[PDB]
Amino acid sequence: ASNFTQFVLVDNGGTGDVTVAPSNFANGVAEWISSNSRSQAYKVTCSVRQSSAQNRKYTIKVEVPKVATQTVGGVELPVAAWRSYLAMKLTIPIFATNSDCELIVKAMQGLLKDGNPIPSAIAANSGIY
Amino acid sequence: ASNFTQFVLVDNGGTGDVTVAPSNFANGVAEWISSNSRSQAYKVTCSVRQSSAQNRKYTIKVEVPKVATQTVGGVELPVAAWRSYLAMKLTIPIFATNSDCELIVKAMQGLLKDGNPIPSAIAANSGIY
Amino acid sequence: ASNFTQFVLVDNGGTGDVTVAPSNFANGVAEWISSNSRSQAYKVTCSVRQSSAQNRKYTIKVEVPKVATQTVGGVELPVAAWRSYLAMKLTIPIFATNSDCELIVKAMQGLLKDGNPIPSAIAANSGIY
Amino acid sequence: ASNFTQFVLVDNGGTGDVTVAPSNFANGVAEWISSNSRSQAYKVTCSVRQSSAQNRKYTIKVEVPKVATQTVGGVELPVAAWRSYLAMKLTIPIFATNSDCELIVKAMQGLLKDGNPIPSAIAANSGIY
Amino acid sequence: ASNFTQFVLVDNGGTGDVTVAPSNFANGVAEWISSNSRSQAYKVTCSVRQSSAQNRKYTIKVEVPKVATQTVGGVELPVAAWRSYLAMKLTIPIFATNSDCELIVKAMQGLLKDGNPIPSAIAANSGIY
Amino acid sequence: ASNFTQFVLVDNGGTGDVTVAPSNFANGVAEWISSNSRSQAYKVTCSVRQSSAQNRKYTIKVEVPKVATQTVGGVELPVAAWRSYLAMKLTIPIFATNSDCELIVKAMQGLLKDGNPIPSAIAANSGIY
RNA sequence: UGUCUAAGACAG
RNA sequence: UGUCUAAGACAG
RNA sequence: UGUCUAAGACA
RNA sequence: UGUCUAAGACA
């Protein structure tokens, strides 16, 4: 209905939340960044296109800063040591109804819900065991 | 512990939930599938690799099917009308602390939380505008 | 005396039990078939032969059908939607005594006993994990 | 959760029981080995793979040794006089539900249940008659 | 019996011990890491395979962090300056009984017991003299 | 001081102990052997090298034999039925403090301490699961 | 790197 | 990198 | 589809 | 040693 708005990316219960806001719409790709230097910010981008005859495809990217021992506003090199990148690609058949899509979103939420396998592994620098 | 446990992939309040369970770990790829014919099952796979000398990369995949009954050769078989695919690559630097990773997980959770931009667009067959 | 008798292949309480009976013994190959439409029957075959100077070799095979009705042109027939195939080869040296053989059989029964790894993986459309 | 655990391969009351434990899982091939001299150990291996578009295939193997002492040049070693080899292939279509699989397993257990044809022939160094 | 559990790697008498816990079981290789960023953690991995016809071989690896002047959670480069690596390879003939193996373990313990030559040399940045 | 001293490699409480002593230091490789015929002796060797411009590498080896009496040409000779080999490479950065090294030694000691995962698996001819 | 018959070897 | 019929693929 | 010393092989 | 429609097959 007009969803390109600011939102809470990292929720720490009001006090200490990381908020992300619209920062670019070039080429139809929506971008959101936290209030930092681009080298230390949280960034989120998203776009959809019909990847093929039968499928539509969402491409979502997220960049999370390494905070431990960080120096706010400083020049931290090498860049690859201070940043994590998430790249999501959601392929959805053109036959999926709004309902079908609502379930796909739920599957994604369940996948990452706190306490489940995957998020528990990532959050502990671990694999599956 | 052991993080290789079953979990509810799609939550619909107790009943109607889509729960998925450990099914394979061959070749270092942890697999979870729902209780159905291998042809109609929901599937989730996860794996971690030391992608670089200073990087670790998680590869996660989810397969949400649209079940159906197809008649092949006059006989009916349990099949999937089509499948939706979620593929995410997560690259975390080896210098990332546990708290640093907890931050990445929170970000992904925040990203897909009901009400926020992206999950809203996806659930309505729409882009961000 | 005879061991080419009918037996219970699948036990489901008292009723719902699949029984298979002797049907053919051509070429030293014993064959058992469940009743009714040969097309939807369970099949078991067995044979032994001196595979070499010091070895005897058993060849056991089992076919479990997926009962169904095929309709083509309005004509319907009792068929098997598909079949699951089991084939085992058992090599036993000529030095094995009756005791040694009784042990080999216990090993086979243990391998498929309820609760153990292999039978549990199969019954859940899974592998080892 | 895990099904790559140790189990009782041969049951002989409470004592005299052969137990086999996880030892290796390279190349998607699960392997169990009984304790003591690897040379006189029982071995079990298992694996699954998509054998075709509509079929998955299991490969189970078991080795039962004939414990003995080899003496050569006055030096003696724990060896296996000989080994009995079991090898089974199980093909299951992707349309099989959990129920269908549970049935296939019951068929296998029935095939080797005490008293029935096949297990009795094997345990008596015999064929069908 | 089920040994993949957490244990004390560096014992400093309760207070100040370094504990290591299961963190991965991909490919059958057991991994244990301390609670740190992977760049600063203690890591232990282990696996066994039959290296040849007559031998089994254990491969054990350990990574110990350089702690003096360390900055917890910081990005320390070059990696090679802040880490020590131990790589053990234990070859055992298939004729070794549990007893034989128990003695091999004792030999390893004696080799590293406090006060003996080897550990005394390593602990003093020395060679043998 | 002089760290080149004899020590008890295998401890069995005063009596039955396997003690090994300095035997050679030719070519910079310190050797210790038990008091037996060179053919049945336990052997331990150690050496240190400045492997890199910023690294030092220790190479340690232990040979545990299985003594036996073989009859060759009608005559009996003291021999080893087989040998077990332990080979470990330890790489420590030149920036490692004495306390840093004491940490590495403690880790290796903790690794092989009775009751812990690895020594337990080894002593039982088993893997970690 | 990996393997062994093991401070010397072999197949990268 | 991208795509799919999806841990395996194809066109860089 | 088969054999052996068996996840490697040999036809 | 392997695949399938399975005691017949196909490499």
Swiss-Prot record, chains A, B, C, D, E, F:
Top-level taxon of origin: Viruses
Stated consequence of mutating residue 76 to A: No effect on the organization of the T=3 capsid, but with a loss of thermal stability. No effect on infectivity
Subcellular location, record wording: Virion
Keyword RNA-binding in record: yes
SUPFAM superfamilies assigned: RNA bacteriophage capsid protein
Segments for region (Viral RNA-binding): 31-104
Biological process according to GO: negative regulation of viral translation; regulation of translation
GO molecular function: identical protein binding; RNA binding; structural molecule activity
InterPro entries: Levivir_coat, Phage_RNA-type_capsid
This protein's UniProt keywords: Capsid protein, RNA-binding, T=3 icosahedral capsid protein, Translation regulation, Virion
GO cellular component: T=3 icosahedral viral capsid
Assembly: Homodimer. The capsid proteins form dimers that assemble by group of 5. Twelve such pentamers are linked together with free dimers. The homodimers binds to the viral RNA via an operator hairpin, but also to many other RNA sequences in the viral genome; this interaction probably shifts the virus from the replicative to the assembly phase and ensures specific encapsidation of the viral genome.
Annotated function: Capsid protein self-assembles to form an icosahedral capsid with a T=3 symmetry, about 26 nm in diameter, and consisting of 89 capsid proteins dimers (178 capsid proteins). Involved in viral genome encapsidation through the interaction between a capsid protein dimer and the multiple packaging signals present in the RNA genome. The capsid also contains 1 copy of the A2 maturation protein.
Sequence similarity: Belongs to the Leviviricetes capsid protein family.
Protein name: Capsid protein
Organism, scientific name: Escherichia phage MS2
